[model samples]
Target: GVVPILVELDGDVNGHKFSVRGEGEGDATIGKLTLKFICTTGKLPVPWPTLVTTLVQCFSRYPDHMKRHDFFKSAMPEGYVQERTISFKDDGKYKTRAVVKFEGDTLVNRIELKGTDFKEDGNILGHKLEYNFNSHNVYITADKQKNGIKANFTVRHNVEDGSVQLADHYQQNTPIGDGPVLLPDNHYLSTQTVLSKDPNEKRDHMVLHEYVNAAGITLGMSKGEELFEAAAKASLEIEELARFAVDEHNKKENALLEFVRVVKAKEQSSVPHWWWTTMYYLTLEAAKVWVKRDPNMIFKINFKELQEFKPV
Candidate 1:
């Protein structure tokens, strides 16, 4: 039996109903695939003008590096992108602040998300979130809430070589689980996950881990389980997508390539922490529909146009 590809998202937040619909198209034979994503939220966060402007500037400058192509468009349609930017300063009850600057050809983008703050288990978890991203590095920090006994886990990606240093201040009771034990230095070392020498390569890997762990904590899961679940979900979705065109001879090759692409797309830019999981699942959900619909149709996904915090 074929797994259903079209995944539907329906949820409610404080009496406001929110839903996201995913779309896709493709062929059974090896060719081109396309997917479309559109989401609608009842109560949304207020748009940060400076942050939106920074996003447009960065995306416009390097469309090739950051634009929607084969996978999905990060933003919305041309008119929508323009309109959203024009009204970037608008927001709901929540308030946001951001600063944008340029360091060489790369633009340094930083944003702070603020509201009533986040709490878990009757304890404050994190209140303010600060994100900084550029072509070279991605740095993020959250203000930990009071009374929460959480490990101070930090990740660093090396540009000189494709190496990673994952350390935690709470070495006595780490939250990474039992997969990779921490060394005496309190850092877990791993080879390059992206295999790219570019500085952003390491940054991308680190950001993905950061958000994955964040998602884990939010869901009351361990870091290892979070990564394992996401990877496992991605692999299954890739297999479903390639089942039509991929056979015993090329199944491994096609599946592996698509998996990497989907993962990269999820963490391509420093959007929102919640966006990482949403984009990942959306891509996979849309893939299910494409693989089963057309055996010879070419499909394209656009993310640049619809990759904002608001609903269109």
Candidate 2:
């Protein structure tokens, strides 16, 4: 049995070294292979945690490829050596640089290499890589002679354009789940829809609480009148629990009464029944315990006083 050979690409010696191996299975003649280089050059006077953070940050933006076999195989690691270089320049400054390259050979689809190296004055602190994609930059120009698809990347000192140079543009690939696009303080979904124009009704914004209730009715939990009945019964249960907690007589007998109210409510409620009832009460019970528990003397108050704390 012949084993697949692993080979590293020729590049700047001090940067990174990566290789790949693949062999066909059963009756197939082609199999996918990936190579990820973790090479470093020169030395850093201080810890370059930011460099590694930035590299991983770049991967976060590429969720689709990051989830791919080749990308994950090459980029992610619980522990590894640094793949960056820092050198002292003649101008009395240290030029910090780092680079990462990923290469993949898909069974019958494509062969590609995507690489990026960043360099910064004094240190590779802040740098950006940019690629602007349009209709023309959407697909890989295949090189049939080399038996693959290929792309090249060049890193300048201080510019970052969010583009898809290595592969194709986003519009070219439909239904590509790259997760949410995270900006500095927010997230935007690829197919997320928003209000395009002003609305006249109060229903302009989506209300998910109604959706939750609708789901309960769809699941045959309850119908129209039963929903209101169940909610009212559940509210009575909460009120009884609250009153019992205040009543030192420990009308433990009433606990079962409360339970019966809920069971009957479940058996007879209308549409959009209490879907949130079970979890909601369970959560409230936990919170009530926390509020009244001995250690939480911080909120020491009487039962009558507790009832005064109403939710807006």
Candidate 3:
């Protein structure tokens, strides 16, 4: 119901004219804010493109209100103006330089204005923000005199603090589908791969593989077993495919001659729907899981690596 409004101002001081006018939606939720201001006293003008380009390229940090709106990771477009004025007072003895930033937009802002960072206040969608340059602090206020904003969004920051005053407010980037956290560079995972000498050969052999996390804990070993258990969930559809592959291979020569857990199983499905193809890659295995995919146990290979330990 409540919407942000961009302000326009006009005034005449000492027979000189100053005006502030902006057009288009200042709402970051909608589009960009286009603000234009001109004053006879304001001699220097900073290009919106320069400010925004520098902002996006070399921004030191974002204001609290920005991260608060979860717009911290959002994009900022270049399209605003600024005015600078150096005024003399007390017979030119006292100097007051004002650099007014009328940046039309930030990722989640509208018409941000600043009187030299000491008093930086601008309109956010449902909030107002003022940044303090000295302490790198910001005072943010939300709709109708509220300090903390009321939105269903999350904000997050880290130990990016030095002297902790203890604070509040922040936190998604686009997420990949749920999968194992990226393990260490040396970490590896595999299921099973059964190798057969001949189709007529009644007995089959499996080259066992291991999955070890960063922690040296191999999959299916106590705590690490959960990895496969998790993959076990991922194992469902592919498990059948693995079995069918074994059976089908057994039909041709025979891989399903023995029952074993999934050694290696992978599925490529763009969706759960069957309009296209759901390709499942499966390899049969004996029923032991370990920490390395190499036929040699991880410990044995570890004169080279525990993390990268390797042994004979």
Candidate 4:
């Protein structure tokens, strides 16, 4: 058996020239020192450490996970390179430039990146992303055509009740042709509503039914006419109105009140469906049925007062 094989590393750490030799015989000689090269270009920018760190993570994983398939095959897995060409200008600002490339492929990406500015006291003067890494959720990608890169990021507690907020939008260049196009220079907001449940407490399903009814009513009162006309103008079927009602019920707060108020206002337009007429005229009987389709009595009807009630 070979006892203690000796391994030696020769010269130049950053010069790309290095050798590893293993000495001894039998099982002890595991393998020769094989050198693998990752080609990189240009200097990286100073302030953007997150970008640097992220690139390193992306680059390093490729070699370990995917080795060159065969020596005869010219195509190798893609690699990333970044170069910081110039220092800050007279105004003291600079952007980082990088690229992801594979030989003769459509995946040649050019990344020109900018970061948020700051004030002296540490208050962010612009849209600086503060990634709370311990509890942050981030999704990042650069398109195949490589013209655009989009990173969707959020910071929130891991628990179900956590209030999550999307922290930033980091992207560069024009929208790519195929993927979900991130339109340039436009304001966008994305939100999700998650209901928290308590296993210790029991509740009736009527609560949810009532909630949807109220929400539907509120949506119908205000946005209903607009949605109706929009659907009509777009040449969509009137059946879309029901879907709009359901979506508003799920998404909006106090939707039922808005529906009641708007329907009460009675702005005359072409009614799209029976539900629209019912909602527009504030017909109590049909409204009860609307709530009953989901089935709820929150919009109560008093028999004596309801007998004399007149809808304008």
Candidate 5:
């Protein structure tokens, strides 16, 4: 059973949903456009990536409406988004001020959903954990077997201004539970959607919309999932964090990747003191003074923070 779909999307903040069409025996050529985006999110390493991932995980579901079904489940089916919402759970003190729905999907679907387009303060876990949405895969794409036709694109949570850059920005691999992992590859034919409109039209009418989401899912580490869940590097102190990287080398007669931002902030069980704020590595998306922040000039500094904060 192989699946095929018509993936389409292009826009920022909103876009036209892709079309899919297919009909075949169980798992045969039954597929739809499996659209996934390469989302680059800021405010990560915690609720940001986790929140965005929650949105992606909601792609597959088909709950009964009202007494006969599940309302929220159907809300985001086959990636067929129609309404938006925000809810919360366990009113804890950690007040994770977050947003829901109005996500990267808006950039592609270009469709309008009523309800709450967005809420800057929806308690985490409220509208989240929509149970398991994988069931929508029947009309979505193909289940368990193939991811179907894919539309790979890059997106950002919100790249408006000087938002804080932290340690751990995520690049969603495949997803959880579905595959050994569901990532990306390609076909030799076009290796792209860069084709003529005629070839494009034939693909526009299919309705088997397969939405295999998977971005920004964190791999839970049982080994470290104990006392602490790592730490959050608010933009407030990110520069000072990443600065140590370049400055350390300066005294050693070498220096200057110019510390763009801390790529990650990790905490593993190797205590030195004070809850052990450890940093395995610091990647600076910076460039030498010779270049104007060229990506190629990126550098990585390995060291432990708080526990002596030494450079390696």
Candidate 6:
């Protein structure tokens, strides 16, 4: 039997959802910024890098066209956007008053999403975790006076789960070391679709189709795609890279990576989190299909030892 799997550094296939956002005029004032991310896991054994990397890459790919509009920059980060700048200062309470920001045609708040196409399903996707913005990625803004309060963000998370400790943000004002850790060599690849046209067909039939037909390019897998799979198997053959990462770093930085490595050594290395988030999500979904085909099985078996078996 053959298995279907795609390994990637970015969490493009995981079910977990996360995002990063920020706003500024020129390069100086990166005003209010925030990054919101959420993941669902039964235990720490589940990986997180895939999801985190996805969020980071999303911001790096924000569109440049929206920089011309104030509202576009703000709302752009989430997807569907419509608003403006308004003025107000924090009187005494824990609040800042609404004030019209970016006077006359200056970049007010520019934002957008990366990864997936925002135009199709950004809002709906964000809604899964109670986040209304969708389209996989976006970066747009809104007006102030006519639009009201607007928020932008670009933040990162550093998790630390332990016995009772101070509140999470208490360390914000404190200085911290760059905890030593070696960088991984593997990374995700970006590919472009090639479309072709059929000139011999009628005008109506000549309409654009999938890239394979639109550009007259074949839609089948390429040698490079095969090489990618080979690379993944070779890289992960030694067990979870996280496992290696754990021993490679100090005790403090090893916590999360070590947790995931334990699962990898169990031969469940093909688990979704073992790869990228998006890949994990898709693998989980595929597993459900296979599990349903054998609901009566009384015992579970590890596929690695079997002469013929399918893997995720």
lDDT of the candidates, in the order given: 0.23, 0.22, 0.24, 0.25, 0.25, 0.21
RMSD to the true structure for each prediction, in A, is: 20.7, 23.2, 26.3, 28.2, 22.4, 23.5
lDDT of 1 by residue, 61-119 (tens): 11122111111011111101111111111111212232322221112223333333212
TM-score against truth, every candidate: 0.20, 0.16, 0.18, 0.21, 0.22, 0.16
1-312 per-residue lDDT for model 6 (tens digits)? 011111112122124333222211121112111322222222211222212212211112112222222221232212222221211111100111111122211212222212322222222222212201111112122223333222332212222332111111000000012222111111221211112334663321111111100011123322222332333343343233333333433343333222332122212235453232111111111011111112233122122111211223
The runs of at least 3 residues in candidate 3 whose Cα sits more than 4 Å from the true structure, single-residue gaps closed, are 1-234, 254-256, 269-276, 286-312
lDDT of 5: 0.25
Considering TM-score, where higher is better, how would the candidates rank from best to worst? 5, 4, 1, 3, 6, 2
Candidate 3, residue 57: Cα displacement in angstroms equals 35
Q: Lowest lDDT 10-mer window, candidate 5?
A: 223-232
Using TM-score as the yardstick, the better of models 3 and 4 is: 4
Q: Per-residue CA lDDT of candidate 2, range 1-312, in tens?
A: 111112222222124322222112111011111222122222322222212111211111122221221121122111112222222222112122222221111111111122233333322223222211111111112223432222222212222443321221111111112332111111211111111212442321110000000000121211212222333343455445544433422242233211222111111223232232121111222113112212333222233212221111
Q: What's model 1's lDDT at 274?
A: 38
Per-residue accuracy of model 3 over 73-127 as CA lDDT, tens digit each: 1212221122222121111111111111223111112222222211111121111
Best by TM-score: 5
Which of the two candidates, 3 or 6, achieves a greater lDDT against the reference? 3
Model 5: per-residue lDDT, tens digit, 118-208?
Answer: 2333322223222111121111112223322222222122212433212122121212122232222221111111111223332222112
